[PDB]
Amino acid sequence: VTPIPLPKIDEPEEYNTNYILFWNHVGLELNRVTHTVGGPLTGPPLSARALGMLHLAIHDAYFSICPPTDFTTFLSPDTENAAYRLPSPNGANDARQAVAGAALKMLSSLYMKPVEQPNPNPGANISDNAYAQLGLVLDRSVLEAPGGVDRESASFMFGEDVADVFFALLNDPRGASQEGYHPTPGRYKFDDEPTHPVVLIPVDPNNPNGPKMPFRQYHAPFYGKTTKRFATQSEHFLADPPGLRSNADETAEYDDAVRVAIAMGGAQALNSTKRSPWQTAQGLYWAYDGSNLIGTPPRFYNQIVRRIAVTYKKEEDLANSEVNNADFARLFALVDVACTDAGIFSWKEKWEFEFWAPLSGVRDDGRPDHGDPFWLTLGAPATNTNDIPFKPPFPAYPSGHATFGGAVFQMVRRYYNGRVGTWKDDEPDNIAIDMMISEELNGVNRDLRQPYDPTAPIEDQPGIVRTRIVRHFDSAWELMFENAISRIFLGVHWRFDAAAARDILIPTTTKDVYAVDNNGATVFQNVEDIRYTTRGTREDEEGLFPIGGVPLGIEIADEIFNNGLKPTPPEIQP
Ligand code: VO4
C-alpha cells in the first residue's frame, strides 16, 4: 500500500536512541496516523487511554527486570486476583527486550485488526486501508528500534505476557459507543453544532467514493461513567456550571462569560473580536484537535514531556543509562496514567452536565442585547484539510484540554520538585523549556485549498502555511495555564470550563464582572500569581468542589502520585 508521507518532527533525533523514548515515540506516531486514516482509538479520551496502557505495560516490564527502590510495580506477581497478577521474569533479564515485547504487543493489540469477532459493531467503521497504514508504522518501528528487537528472547516474550495482562484488564472496546444517546434540547443544553449539524459519511468505509449517509456524532457519551479507571483512588466531581443546578442563580457570571466569549473567541475578521494576534497564536498552539498528521492533545503533551525529560535527565548518555531508563519509564507511566484518568473524569463530567458550547450559547441566547444569532468562532483548527473550523462533538464543561493539562503538568511538578528547584506543590515551579514548537504552528502544516492527499507530503500540497513559532516557557505552571486559556481564544470553551473566573481573571468592583483593557480585550492574572482556590457547590452532593478542568486535573494528579501509582481498587470501579 502507499505509505503516508509523514512530516518531520521538531525534536533532537538523539531522543530516540533511548528505547523508552523510542517506544513512546511509536505510540505518538500511531496516534497521528490513526487520526489521518480514521483508525481505532481516535478522539481525546481514548487516545490518552492507549498511551496510558502502553506506558503501564512498559513500566512493569522494565521494573520487573530492574527492580525499583522507592516504589514498586503497578501490578504484583503475588496478587491472588488473576486479573491483577503480574507475570514473573523467571530468568529473563534483558530489560531492552522486555520493553520491546511489552510495547510491541500492547500497540499491536490496540491497533490491529480484531480477528476475534470484535470487528463487528465496535470496529465496524474502520477501513482496511486504515489498519494497513497503522501496520506499516508498527512494522518499521521494529526495524528502527535502538538495539533491535529479538522476538525470540525470553525477555521479549516476558514483556508480551505483561502486555497481555494490562490489555485484558484495561482495554475498553466499546468505550466510544454513542448508541442510545440523543441530545435533550433546552437552554444550556448540548446539541448538534450549528456550523456542522450533520456530516455525510460513506456507507462503506472501504469505498469512500461510494454512497454517503447522514451522520450525527456524539463523542463517547457513556465512557466516563462506565469505564475502568487506572490509578485514581476515588471519584472526582466539579461544581455545577454557572446557570445550572445549584448555581443556576449565577447569572452575572454567565452573562459576563457570554461577553468574554464573543470578544475573545470570535472569528478573526468580526468587528466584535478583540483578541490579539499573539492570543490567536496561543489558541492554535495548543489545539491538536484530531487533525490529519497531528493527532490529539495527549500527543502534544507527550511531545512536551519528552523535552522536559531530556532537558532534566540525571545522566548525559541517552542510549546506555539505566538511571535515565528508569527515570523515563517511571515519569511517562505517571504522566500518561494521569492523562488517562483526566480523560475519564473530564468526559464523565462533560456528559453529566451536558453544558452547551459558546457557539450555541451565544447564538441561542435569545436576549437581543446579549446574544449574537450569527456569531462565528475562531474554532478548532481543521489543520491539513480544506474544511472549516468546528467545535469538537461533545459538551463544554469542563475543558478536556484544561483537565489533561492540569493532570499532566501537575504530575511533572510533583515528580521534579526538589530536583529542578523547590516549590510548594500548589505554587509556581521553575521547570522551564525552550525551543518548543507546536505542529499547529511549525511552518510546515497548513490549511489546504483542496482535499488532503495522503500519497503526497504536506509540503507539495497548496495551502496557507502556518507561521513557525518557537516558544519558551518558564514553568509547568505556565504551560498548564496557557493550555487552558487557549480554548477561550478559539471560542470553543467558556472561561469557567478552564478554571474559576476569579482565579484566572482580573476582577473589577462589580462582582462576577472582570476587567478589560483599553480595546476591550480581557485581562488575565499573571501566571506567577494564579492560584486555583475558588470552589463551588453541587446540587446532588454536599461540600465544595473544584470549578473547571485545570483544578480537576491537578486534583487527579496529586491523588495518583500521593498513592504512588496504585491501581484503582476494583471495589470502587463502575
Ligand atoms: O478539549 V475541549 O474539551 O478543551 O475542546
Q: Do 193 and 214 have their domain in common? A: yes
CATH number at residue 21: 1.20.144.10
The total number of residues written for the chain in this structure: 574
Of 142, 159, 175, the domain-final residue = 175
CA angle, 171 as apex, 24 and 77 as ends, to 5°? 80
Q: Do 278 and 134 have their domain in common? A: no
User: Is 89 near ligand 1, meaning CB less than 6 Å away?
Assistant: no
Q: Do 18 and 134 have their domain in common? A: yes
Angle separating helix axes 322-353 and 549-562, nearest 10 degrees: 130
Contact 46, 306 (CB under 8 A): no
For residue 205, give the amino acid letter.
P
Contact 219, 554 (CB under 8 A): no
Question: Distance from the CA of 134 to the center of ligand 1, in angstroms?
Answer: 26
Distance, CA of 340 to CA of 512 (rounded, Å):
33
Contact 298, 341 (CB under 8 A): no
Q: In Å, how far are 3, 412, 413, 469 from 418, measured between CA atoms?
A: 46, 12, 10, 31
Question: Distance from the CA of 351 to the center of ligand 1, in angstroms?
Answer: 13
For residue 308, give the amino acid letter.
I
Question: Distance from the CA of 487 to the center of ligand 1, in angstroms?
Answer: 7
Distance, CA of 496 to CA of 397 (rounded, Å):
8
Contact 359, 368 (CB under 8 A): no
Distance, CA of 97 to CA of 115 (rounded, Å):
27
Of 175, 203, 218, the domain-final residue = 175
User: Is 391 near ligand 1, meaning CB less than 6 Å away?
Assistant: no
User: Is 491 near ligand 1, meaning CB less than 6 Å away?
Assistant: no
Distance, CA of 130 to CA of 37 (rounded, Å):
5
Distance, CA of 73 to CA of 59 (rounded, Å):
7
Q: Do 144 and 221 have their domain in common? A: no
Contact 34, 135 (CB under 8 A): no
Distance, CA of 359 to CA of 365 (rounded, Å):
10
Q: Do 447 and 552 have their domain in common? A: yes
Q: In Å, how far are 37, 170, 334, 355, 555 from 573, measured between CA atoms?
A: 33, 12, 20, 25, 19
| SS3 of 470-524 | EEEECCHHHHHHHHHHHHHHHCCCCHHHHCCHHHHECECCCCCCECECCCCCECE
Q: Do 98 and 61 have their domain in common? A: yes
Angle separating helix axes 297-311 and 322-353, nearest 10 degrees: 150
What is the 3-state composition of the chain as percent helix, strand, coil, each rounded to the nearest 5? 45, 10, 50
Torsion of CA 257, 258, 259, 260, to 10 degrees: 50
Of 175, 199, 225, the domain-final residue = 175
Q: In Å, how far are 10, 145, 162, 223, 246 from 14, measured between CA atoms?
A: 12, 13, 28, 38, 53
All three cell numbers of 126: 474502520
Q: Is 401 a catalytic residue?
A: yes
Question: Distance from the CA of 549 to the center of ligand 1, in angstroms?
Answer: 9
Q: Do 159 and 233 have their domain in common? A: no
User: Is 400 near ligand 1, meaning CB less than 6 Å away?
Assistant: yes
Distance, CA of 254 to CA of 323 (rounded, Å):
51
> Taking the CB of residue 274, how many other CB atoms lie within 10 A of it?
18
Exposure class string for 368-400: b at 16+ Cβ within 10 A, else e: eeebeeebbbbbbbbbbbebebbbbbbbbbbbb
Resolution in angstrom units: 2.3
> Taking the CB of residue 77, how many other CB atoms lie within 10 A of it?
13
H helix intervals, 174-321: 223-226, 251-265, 277-285, 297-311
Handedness of CA 454, 460, 462, 466 (dihedral sign): positive
202 phi/psi in degrees, rounded to 5: -65, 145
Q: Do 32 and 53 have their domain in common? A: yes
CA angle, 554 as apex, 107 and 264 as ends, to 5°? 95
For residue 562, give the amino acid letter.
N
Distance, CA of 400 to CA of 236 (rounded, Å):
14
Q: Do 494 and 397 have their domain in common? A: yes
Which of 289, 354, 493, 496 is the pocket-test mutation for ligand 1 (most atoms within 8 Å of CB)? Answer: 493
What's 389's DSSP letter?
P
- DSSP sequence for 284-349: HHT---SBTTTB-HHHHHHHHHHHHHHHT-SSS-SSS-HHHHHHHHHHHHHHHHHHHHHHHHHHHH
Distance, CA of 213 to CA of 196 (rounded, Å):
15
Q: Do 321 and 450 have their domain in common? A: yes
- DSSP sequence for 121-138: TTSTT--HHHHHHHHHHH
User: Is 219 near ligand 1, meaning CB less than 6 Å away?
Assistant: no
Q: Do 92 and 204 have their domain in common? A: no
Contact 432, 474 (CB under 8 A): yes
3-state SS class at 167? helix
Quick one: 303 exposed, middle or buried, by C-beta within 10 A (0-12, 13-18, 19+)? buried
- Contacts of range 310-319, beta carbons closer than 8 Å, 24 or more positions apart: 310/12, 310/14, 310/15, 310/21, 311/433, 312/416, 312/419, 312/420, 312/431, 318/14, 318/15, 318/17, 318/18, 318/21, 319/17, 319/18, 319/146
CATH number at residue 212: 1.10.606.10
Nearest alpha-carbon partner for 292 in 38, 465, 464: 38
308 phi/psi in degrees, rounded to 5: -60, -45
Q: Tell me how many domains the chain contains.
A: 2
Distance, CA of 268 to CA of 5 (rounded, Å):
32
Beta bridge partners of 514: 507
Exposure class string for 502-540: b at 16+ Cβ within 10 A, else e: bbbbeeeeeebbbebeeeebbebbebeebebebebebee
Nearest alpha-carbon partner for 514 in 499, 552, 276, 528: 499
For residue 456, give the amino acid letter.
A
Atom of ligand 1 nearest to the CA of 401: 4
Q: Do 396 and 533 have their domain in common? A: yes
Angle separating helix axes 400-416 and 297-311, nearest 10 degrees: 20
Distance, CA of 446 to CA of 442 (rounded, Å):
9
- E strand or H helix that includes residue 545: strand 545-546
The boundaries of the domain holding residue 84 are 1-175
Strand 212-215 and strand 433-437: pairing?
Answer: unpaired
